[PDB]
Structures are given as C-alpha cells and as structure tokens.
Amino acid sequence: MSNSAIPLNVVAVQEPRLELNNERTWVVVKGGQQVTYYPFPSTSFSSNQFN
C-alpha cells in the first residue's frame, strides 16, 4: 500500500500553483441595515469620580 504497518491512508493534495478544479462558490456577505455610532457625554462627571 502501504509499507508502514500499520499501513496508513494515502491522499494526494494539489500544488498551490494549480488547482484548477474544485467548487468555486460565490459568497454573498450579509449584515443588517443601519450601523450608527453615538458619543455619550457624561452628566455628573466630577474630577474625583465619573459615570
């Protein structure tokens, strides 16, 4: 097979340079509408504590 008992599985991978066949799937990336950032200035900030 084989040759290294217990004999093991053999699979042959491709070179990165050439595939050139395998499932090319177009991937639609989707994330919900309306991201927004808002800055929250403090009220009752003081020099010793703030919240």
Next chain:
Amino acid sequence: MSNSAIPLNVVAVQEPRLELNNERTWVVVKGGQQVTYYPFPSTSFSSNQFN
C-alpha cells in the same frame, strides 16, 4: 377574677426569668445581594442654584 362589677376574663403570663417553655424559631434574615453606593456629582452646579 369574675369578682368585678362586670365579670372580666383572666390570663396568665410568666415572669421574665422563666418561660421556660414556648415554641422557639430560627429567623434567617434575607436581603437582596449587592448593596452599592455612589457619589453623583452635580451636573452644572453654580453660585446661584445647583442641581
């Protein structure tokens, strides 16, 4: 006891130094976890009015 103008009803009490028997219980005292404190400093004090 029924010695008064209108008969009155009797009961007995025990002197403090001896009951010595009456039903006792154990009273566990439940108070929500996580008491906190915080100084809220005045959002926009002044010399005239602060708040």
